[PDB]
Amino acid sequence: TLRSITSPLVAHRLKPIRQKTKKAVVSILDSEEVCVELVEYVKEVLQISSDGNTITIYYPNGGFPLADRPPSPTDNISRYSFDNLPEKYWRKYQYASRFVQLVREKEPKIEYFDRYAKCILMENSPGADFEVWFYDGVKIHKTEDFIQVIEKTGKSYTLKSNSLKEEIKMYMDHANEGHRICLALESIISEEERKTRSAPFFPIIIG
């Protein structure tokens, strides 16, 4: 069971992207499906559901040239659950998940303009990244692992654990309020998309 190792990917609300590695192309489609074309001709396509829990695999007949769109499916097709997926495709599923993990860290879920900064909560929940692009060129990025400060000069620092330099704290004190605010809205609005179950309320731009 792939489960014993990794976890199902999440691509919900991800804008489209196509990147060519050497071994193959990876995509996020308008459907928020994830496509891995193994490879210059495509010999194998994996199409993972936006949830992670479904993997569709189709081949050609013959020895599928490269393209904008991925190749429309064939009758040589299969479907697996995350649990049923054969070992053979596991490292492919993990390429797709690493990639998607990359995108979500940089995919805004909420953009909020305070008097003093642009605040960005990312899609890499739980514990998503949080960027604060101060309008006077200060930058504070918060991560589960750590916090990066960049000063108006370019002095850039990490704090995996505080006294900063006091003046840093005015900015960090703000960053924190912004995080508390974007985390309260995300909860409120998320509550609403539960109660209504209509169309996604994310991402949002505020102010």
Added chain:
Amino acid sequence: RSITSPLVAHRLKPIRQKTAVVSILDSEEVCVELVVKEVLQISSDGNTITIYYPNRGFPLADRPPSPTDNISRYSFDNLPEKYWRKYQYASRFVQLVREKEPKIEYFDRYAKCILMENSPGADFEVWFYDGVKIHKTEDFIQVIEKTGKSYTLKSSLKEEIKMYMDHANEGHRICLALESIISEEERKTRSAPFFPIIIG
């Protein structure tokens, strides 16, 4: 006061229109330059009017003349009648901006919904992805079919279009519920404003 209510320019993006010149400043203050020779600056909340004269003077710049010492402040109530029709010009203008100024853009699978800033009872435009368009108002609803066949109903079932009108009504209910939820939170937080908002 007896007549017009104080204007509201909260969250309105800047604009200078020439006719007198009227402006909404980056401060959400409303400026009327009469022609210059007189400047009225109404507060974003409508209740304070600052009036200053040149020391004519003031050639028509693209920005309002910086402040002078021939200056007055009034309350909405204190405002002398000499200035009432100037205030009312400013109020009509702002009513016009607000009706076309969006507070909420929501992207449904079928359409773009826009609740405007002309509360209470704000306009609600539904720009369907297929080219259908519905515009709700307190007075009436305009329907534009894909053809162009406009139809300003004022009170009715015409069939088929009811599929779209039902969607439009859902979107309104959804946008009117988000406004309430995010409005509660803004009441409880004291942070920077939460509107406008784009969702989707």
